[PDB]
Amino acid sequence: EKFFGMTTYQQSFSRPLKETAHQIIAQSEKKINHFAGTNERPVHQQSTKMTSVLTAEKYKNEQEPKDNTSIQRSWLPYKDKALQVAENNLIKNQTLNQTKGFTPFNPLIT
Amino acid sequence: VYKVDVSNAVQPKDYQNHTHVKKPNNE
Amino acid sequence: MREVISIHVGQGGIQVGNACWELFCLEHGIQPDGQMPSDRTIGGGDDAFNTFFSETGAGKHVPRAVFLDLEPTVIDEVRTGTYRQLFHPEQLISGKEDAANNFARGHYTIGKEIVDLCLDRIRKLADNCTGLQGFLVFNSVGGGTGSGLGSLLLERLSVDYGKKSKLGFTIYPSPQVSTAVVEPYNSILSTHSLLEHTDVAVMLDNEAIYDICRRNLDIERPTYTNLNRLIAQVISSLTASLRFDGALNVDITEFQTNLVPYPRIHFMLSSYAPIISAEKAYHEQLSVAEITNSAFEPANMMAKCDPRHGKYMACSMMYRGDVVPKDVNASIATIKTKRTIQFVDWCPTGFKVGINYQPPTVVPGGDLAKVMRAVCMISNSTAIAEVFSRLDHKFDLMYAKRAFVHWYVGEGMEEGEFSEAREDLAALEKDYEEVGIET
Amino acid sequence: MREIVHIQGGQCGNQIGAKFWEVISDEHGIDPTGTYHGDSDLQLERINVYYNEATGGRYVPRAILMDLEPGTMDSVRAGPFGQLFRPDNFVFGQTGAGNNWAKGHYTEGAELIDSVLDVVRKEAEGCDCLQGFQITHSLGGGTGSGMGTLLISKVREEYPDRIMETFSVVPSPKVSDTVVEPYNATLSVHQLVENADECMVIDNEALYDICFRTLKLTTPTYGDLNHLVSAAMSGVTCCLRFPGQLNSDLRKLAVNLIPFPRLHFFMIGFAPLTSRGSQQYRALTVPELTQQMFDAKNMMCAADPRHGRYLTASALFRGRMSTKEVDEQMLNVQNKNSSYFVEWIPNNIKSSICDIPPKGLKMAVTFVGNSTAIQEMFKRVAEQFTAMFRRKAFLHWYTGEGMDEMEFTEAESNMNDLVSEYQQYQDATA
């Protein structure tokens, strides 16, 4: 003589099972001065999520030489000025983020 | 004979913990 | 700037959209409450979420989705579920009475009072859109409200917007394993409707995905959630190019210029690889050649149809992860070398490749394992006429004695609809047979 | 919100109604006083389907109690759970029917039916989105088989679009409890085919043999038969009341089970059923459920389903299970028994799934079947009718209330026509 009562949706994703007494009171204090509406995206910011810091290729550097790029692109008669510039840019961006403080879950966001 | 021999021979015990076989320096 | 509009009509459409929106939220890092967990600032010079989500300005984002159904069950259960604060309250359109497996009910009597409200919602949702790319519609064809509302919405959209592309992810009935009995009728009628008004259609029957789940994941107790997760993975792999960088970016417009030789031929079937569990992933090579060969392995298709019975017209495979053009080309060359895959004579080059650097995301508690490489394939072939032939056989075998026709005619449907649908199916099969010949 | 009203009449109908309301209240967690004392929230969002709403914190069932004599209503109100039904919903005469279809349908029924039509119209207008009606009564008796079908005709005239279920306890001659059963049985069957959209016949002999053979109890009363019928009744509308993976309502069942307008006679069953000694020694799996599902001796009717061929069938599974096994089992039972399923229709079994099993059970399934084997009952009733009517036995009681032999002849002709047109599909090949 049980009821069970756990539908497939609830087993799949979740069931909230929350909302104590003080939680609702605490959450209402968030919108004491919260206002509906928005401004516009200031343009020149809408783009795709960039991953590589190079062009036309995925900049990957690891200990294994077959996927280090710099080890692979050393056949040139000289030292290419794209890899060193990218590394210096990464270090400079790291330092600039440390000066401000962002820790944005990865260095690539900022 | 059955009741006194087989039916009441075993107790709740003898079932509690049942485990069988599982699958120089010198120098 | 680039975004799509997703339409989810019918129980199957809603239950697929639920999983795909879960996947999108997890992929973009949006919490189920809709709020990003901060730590995504620094002037944030990229709206990777703009394709699927639109920000309200301070915190949360709302999906570009609309939900339709005439029974309130799934809609209210989503409203009361854990995603209650995500969706917009007035874009979960719900009805009052079920359509009850009746195309006439879904298309002539009770769909009229809902289609106007749905069109108003779509217009409102598209006005604030600025770079509209197309429509993505999910529905079930062997169902009353599904087929009826899908047909009505496609017909009204094709005249209210016109040249805008729309992509259809339908679910035709499986060859033998099926639920309903009167499903051939409204399946035929919905095929009749979608033939002229759907730009690209994808077949997503259930027996093939059951076979895939049993053979690959070694799962003997599958349900609809697993199939929905696979379909969500397919959709995400298809639309990753609109929101992530890659060596070869393929937009939504390089389908109706790349996979459709003729206006009447736009039906295709999909595939996906790799599909492995969380225990055997570490013992596998999982190379580009291996995953591409798994894609072309005939039993791995997402529709119950044998490609060996027909030729290939045009294939487009989208690689994501850390693939390389050199080994992509090498694998394609090996495919062309192997005899068992036959193309059509008038198509000497038959591949389009798209590459993306984003590795696939993995939902917690799922069946798929964490992988670094994946490929999703959409192939147009002449072997798809078999499903139409068997559906036609199932239709006319019971239509010979006018079974279940009073149910359809008592709601206002004229009897000639069945005849004209049959003739148009016969014409479509004739066109496929004529195209499949050599020259 | 697709809510349905309940009408019960006659002694048997009143007993089935009382047991059904007890089962529904127990399942939803409703006290006999009408107060909710459940645990989960799933039991309240769909409470309005079967229960109206009243001030004071209590729910009232939307049922109409109707008869020509107050004895059975006295009994049901005196018994437990008798406080739920509204005192305004009791409609009764002062004379009785006396096993006379003419008395129940022409003289007293006509003058009494106004009040019950008024209360039914009141409830129907009170409910917002009506879904249909469900009737429980008996055909071998007077007051039910007459005035209930008169009310059926009136309600079908008033509400043409709504659906109408019916749970008729047709009489089996093996256990005969009246000498004039064939007459009013044929008269009621002749009137049911024009109006009732779904009919689900029941046999007391079938119930008795099920309880003796499966449940294995020596002295069964009417209570356990009523409980079995109530379980079958409540299994039909599970998906309309609880969430599931494949929702299916009454109109879906009708449109998926009725090929032709005059073939709306079904035969039902329930599973799992087991004796009390073997309660814990049997495994609850989809294969076992579907194996007991198609057993001929598990049916609620005396007709043998292996003497004919199924046209269509429907399965309403309950509990958390796998759609793959459900569909594979359906395909397997359709293939291994291809002889017993008519060939000119493919995939003549419908599967539906609900996520909430009954209290105390893990999974359960209800089978509703449209089979050619139901014609034996009509054939035997028509044979008895002809044998008794050849000599005009007991005919003066019927004809003394304005009833003429022409209607008897027409009813016999209609029943014979139904049998002929219903059995002519058994050998039909496309």
Add this chain to the structure above:
Amino acid sequence: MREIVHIQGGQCGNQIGAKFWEVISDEHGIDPTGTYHGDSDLQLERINVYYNEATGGRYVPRAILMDLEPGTMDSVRAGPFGQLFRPDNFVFGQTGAGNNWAKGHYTEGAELIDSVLDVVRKEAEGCDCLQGFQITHSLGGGTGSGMGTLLISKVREEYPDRIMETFSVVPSPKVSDTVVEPYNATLSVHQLVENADECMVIDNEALYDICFRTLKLTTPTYGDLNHLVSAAMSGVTCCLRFPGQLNSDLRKLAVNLIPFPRLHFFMIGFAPLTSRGSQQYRALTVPELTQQMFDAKNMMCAADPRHGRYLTASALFRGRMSTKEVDEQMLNVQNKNSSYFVEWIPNNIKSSICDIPPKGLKMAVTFVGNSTAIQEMFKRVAEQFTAMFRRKAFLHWYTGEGMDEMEFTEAESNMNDLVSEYQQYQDATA
């Protein structure tokens, strides 16, 4: 490059293979979880011979496990070092052969071998440049004796130019565990001599004698016997996996050891072997290593070298040592035992020097000898075979699954021909 794949069948073969993989993993510094943690460069220098590299940087052996019974399969899966193997490579039947060669070679083997041949083809086409195959099985057990030899036939049919190695444990008379053992032993030999390029024979009684006398262990077990066999097996491919002064591979060994096409049955042995008590009293030198090598009591076989004459012999030396010492020792022993060596081939000893000794020892020796004394085992087996076959005992099991007595007669005739032609060269003189 020049890598080899490993396939094992039967219970004894599976145990041998499991201990061999443990030994190889320990020598190459691979942990049971498949991660590399070696201490020297030469450990990883040539790891491609026996292992495959998957995603994530872990190593999996290219071993294919075949059987008809899942018991030993589950045991080896749950045992130590059971996580290295790829789960897909496990292929097994569900019935078993019941120590019946006919059952393992005609009824279930023919229907099961398709999948294992598919996976073998997958591995062979995946490897860069195949060197050969090595197989571990027994000639007493029905399933191994039948399915292994059928798979040898198929593999030789599909890959003609490669090398095939078999480490087979032949029946012993004093230590017997099966009553139908001579039958399937002779049946296995008949098919093996036709296709196998090399064959290596081991005896349980010989292992017991070695471990009891040379090792002085009170309670030996299958773990110890498998360890001995595994060390002797890895001694062969030591020189292929490690550098040396005179490197030699499997083809080199075959050419230098096989004079005539059908005389390819060898006996092996390992040195040094000393007890724990006498561990510190010994001095490891080439003379004493060669003395223990040529000692008859160190052979892995019950055949006595003094009952025959050596055709050719090979000695693979591991460790840093001078070549002149080895050459002088070989010449000295060949001159001292000239009566025991065949005289129409001069310098019938081949020596190879490798610079990497086994882990824990400064020096080690592996010996492979082709001598005329091996005919005794076939003589005893054929004697038992004809003694049982003259009465047709136990023959109905083999005759009821497709075979007949003509196959047995042909196998006996082929074994006798092998014995006679192998004895001919013993007394053949120049």
Add this chain to the structure above:
Amino acid sequence: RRNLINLAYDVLAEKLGQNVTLSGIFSAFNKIRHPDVVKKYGTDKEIFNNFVLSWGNLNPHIAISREQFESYYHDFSACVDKEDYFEVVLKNSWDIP
């Protein structure tokens, strides 16, 4: 019941080292398996929420000892009458082998 409770602490103690706190116990609690989660009676969120509320108003940073640990589960054993149900909770929650 006492030695089973005592044995449960030791495996918890060796995992958390010298000291044990409420936060450490909460982290080490195995919500995934439980006796009832496998039967799908309730979700993981109920069990963890019930556990922290049952552990009182104590601050997560405070450290408890063996006597405090035994006293808390003395109540759990007191209310639980099924000896098999009590055994399965301890072994599954704290990974008792």
